[PDB]
């Protein structure tokens, strides 16, 4: 029942694309999936069918059309740390693109220049996986948001 999960007063944002949030209560669905992940504050607007950048293109690629909802709330407590977050990582750059609905678990090295990387670094071979910055002493755009 998708009616009790809308007025529960326990979520920050609740945007639905294509399918209306008041019509999926009595609508049948074949397969229902859920991609639970935590990102930054400025990366919440990038999760939309038709955006681009360095996160929505190399990490989690979204199709052009989307017939679902985007659930995302705020924690900023029961999780996170003071003085910096050193637990989770995220890919920044990637030499190749990714098709929508695809997971990349390869710890490859981004090749910026023409020198072969993957193993040897020093110049034109940077580390793509970057660290977050979930700190409760910052503003709003620097808080962890769990996007499902």
């Amino acid at each position, epitope marked *: 029942d998708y009616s009790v999960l809308y007025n529960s007063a326990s979520f920050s944002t609740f945007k639905c694309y294509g399918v209306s949030p008041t019509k999926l209560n009595d609508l049948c669905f074949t397969n229902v999936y859920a991609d639970s992940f935590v990102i930054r504050g400025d990366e919440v607007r990038q999760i939309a069918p038709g955006q681009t950048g360095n996160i929505a293109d190399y990490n989690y690629k979204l199709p052009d059309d989307f017939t679902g909802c985007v659930i995302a709330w705020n924690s900023n407590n029961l999780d996170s740390k003071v003085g910096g977050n050193y637990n989770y990582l995220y890919r920044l750059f990637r030499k190749s693109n990714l098709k929508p609905f695809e997971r990349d678990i390869s710890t490859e090295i981004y090749q910026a*220049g*023409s*020198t072969p990387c993957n193993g040897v670094k020093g110049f*034109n071979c940077y580390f793509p996986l970057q660290s977050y910055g979930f700190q409760p002493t910052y503003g709003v755009g620097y808080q962890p948001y769990r996007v499902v």
Partner: antibody
Amino acid sequence: LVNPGASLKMSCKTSGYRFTSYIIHWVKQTPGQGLEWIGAIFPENDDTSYSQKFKGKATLTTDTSSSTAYMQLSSLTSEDSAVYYCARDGENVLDYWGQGTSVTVSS
Amino acid sequence: QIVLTQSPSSLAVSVGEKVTLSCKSSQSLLYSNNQKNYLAWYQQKSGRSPKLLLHWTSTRESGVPDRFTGSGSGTDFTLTISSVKAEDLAVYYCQQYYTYPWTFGGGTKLEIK
């Protein structure tokens, strides 16, 4: 015209091509001598790459909004005066290696 | 910090004559993983921007005549030009592509006899 010990800033913008390159290059060539590589720049995280000969005299800054690479030269000398060429580097060359500006150093 | 040595100092070539110029690198510029030689050949006409003629020594540049052909094995790299013309005369240079720091070991003026 820069006196010895002056600071010189050179900026070049690619024409007909919009970014789409993962490296930018700086070359110093004195007349009658071959081209010498100086530094390489990266569009995202700064490459901050400098040649050992030019290390401590060259600083590399890139601004995406400006769309022009910046090179700062310090402790200029009579030997330092030369034609410096803005360049780049993608797969090979795509109208990325631009022209050069003559430098004259005198009091 | 591999310096590259290029010879000779001068090249005398007649119009429509094949010529061979060779640049030697102190260390092999072949990456072990791809087993491919790395090197760049440059043309330097007077009052002109430095221009890449051949890349990797295996691929010709776009809009470049087949007359300019380069074959390089290990440390030794060779570039061969044919049907040389007055416009073609330029300083020829070899640039290491294998590893930083980049070294320009290019160095050959082209003249017409």
